[PDB]
């Protein structure tokens, strides 16, 4: 029974970072305590200075990743400041009942609620706001994130064999529907409400103005590139709460990947591109073998390069001519 078990409290961290946590653990079930605060705010979503009338869990797109183990209990305290204008709530795809939490988390501006549910199933799971009559708006505006529920003794290959990551990066892909004026310029709204009617219309076309990792074109490039080292193993956690995507690491693979994002099932190996179903989250392991810059992207290349769905992983270490060597460099033809 749940009232009896140890109540730990975790401090969350902004993506791509994931909060620190045991993979395998001899530890037993506990109630884990989180807190998240909804912030509505205008955000800059590209290099041209186009804005989005955004909504977010806890300041960010996506919301931070929540990490616990199978059979733990999740205790989320959800706060909606009076600085906000809207009702919000939360649907945990990892919960069971009450539209995944949504019914028991309806907070108006100035309200807050606390909700406990049981992580009976392992995997990466989406969470997003689902206020009634505005689910698709709030979600495409940035109110989604990931709940990872690790198996109790780590991640496992198809032959039951153990598997280990040295760090976990989390990526939320956000298909955005930003409107235009008659002059073909993206619109700029002076409040959130003024964004509504125009945005829903762009929604109905099913054609995003932008598609972005973690909030902006270039969110995860240059000095915000992800980092790793030859020999290191990374967990890449991809979420998409509204629309399909197809991740791919250029010059890489998914050594093991649960694209439906559920660890109970055996992962596939050696993937070039895998597939995240809209309203799902998934994860993939890669142990780096070569240094250099890698591109982690949605392998619709229009969506990637034109619309904004690509980031970089800067990787350090020792080039390795067995895997790949240049015989003759670009030289003229005989």
């Amino acid at each position: 029974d749940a009232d009896k078990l140890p109540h730990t409290k975790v401090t969350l961290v902004a993506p791509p970072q994931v909060h620190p946590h045991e993979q395998a653990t001899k530890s037993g079930p506990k109630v884990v305590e989180f807190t998240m605060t909804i912030e509505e705010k205008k955000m800059v979503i590209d290099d041209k200075g186009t804005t989005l009338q955004a909504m977010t869990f806890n300041g960010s797109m996506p919301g931070p990743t929540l990490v616990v183990h199978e059979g733990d209990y999740v205790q989320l305290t959800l706060v909606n400041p009076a600085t906000n204008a809207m009702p919000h709530n939360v649907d945990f795809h990892g919960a069971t009942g009450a539209l995944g939490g949504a019914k028991l988390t309806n907070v108006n501006p100035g309200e807050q609620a606390t909700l406990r549910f049981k992580a009976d199933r392992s995997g990466t799971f989406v969470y997003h706001c689902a206020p009634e009559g505005m689910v698709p708006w709030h979600v495409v505006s940035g109110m989604s994130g990931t709940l990872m529920v690790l198996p109790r003794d780590g991640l496992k290959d198809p032959q039951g064999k153990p598997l280990h990551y040295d760090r976990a990066y989390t990526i939320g892909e956000f298909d955005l529907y930003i409107p235009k004026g008659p002059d073909g310029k993206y619109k700029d709204y002076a409040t959130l409400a003024e964004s509504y009617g125009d945005t829903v219309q762009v929604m109905r076309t099913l054609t995003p103005s932008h598609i972005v990792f973690n909030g902006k074109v270039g969110a995860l490039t240059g000095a915000n590139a992800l980092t790793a080292k030859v020999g290191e193993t990374v967990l890449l956690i991809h979420s998409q709460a509204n629309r399909d995507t197809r991740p791919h690491l250029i010059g890489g693979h998914g050594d093991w990947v649960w694209e439906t994002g559920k660890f109970a099932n055996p992962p596939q190996r050696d993937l070039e591109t895998w597939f995240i179903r809209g309203g799902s989250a998934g994860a993939a392991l890669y142990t780096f073998k070569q240094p250099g810059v890698y591109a982690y992207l949605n392998h619709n290349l229009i969506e990637a390069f034109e619309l904004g769905a690509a980031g970089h992983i800067k990787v350090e270490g020792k080039w390795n001519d067995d895997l790949m060597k240049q015989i003759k460099a670009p030289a003229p033809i005989p």
Binding site: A82, M134, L192
Partner: protein
């Protein structure tokens, strides 16, 4: 007389961010009083069509506020945080002298849909 419009989040019948009632026919010298029945909303003129030479209203946020039915004509009043969600109200002071401005006034989306509904309620 003094008439009470409630600032409210939902209506019994689903749809959100509403003044209740959305339309109100009153007399010269009356006062409409909009009221924080739920926190989150405010009441304030709609400048783009509010009539010539009249005390604009920009009542405070989450706070009650009063309108003085002085000159007679129609008086559109948004809630600024939610006017894009159609939270809007129309107040008739006797004759609708300035209906033609109001009809032309280019409201859009939920604002338009709701306001036009209030417009039909105009007594002529």
């Amino acid at each position: 007389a003094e008439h009470i419009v409630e600032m409210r989040n939902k209506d019994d019948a689903g749809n959100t961010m509403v003044f209740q009632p959305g339309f109100v026919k009153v007399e010269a010298g009356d006062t409409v009083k909009f009221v924080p029945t739920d926190k989150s909303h405010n009441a304030e003129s709609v400048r783009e069509v509010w009539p010539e030479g009249v005390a604009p209203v920009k009542g405070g946020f989450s706070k009650e506020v009063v309108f003085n039915a002085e000159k007679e004509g129609l008086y559109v009043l948004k809630c600024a945080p939610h006017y894009g969600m159609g939270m809007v109200v129309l107040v008739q002071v006797g004759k609708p002298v300035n209906l033609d401005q109001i009809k032309e006034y280019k409201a859009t989306g939920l604002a338009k849909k709701r306001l036009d509904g209030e417009i039909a309620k105009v007594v002529q």
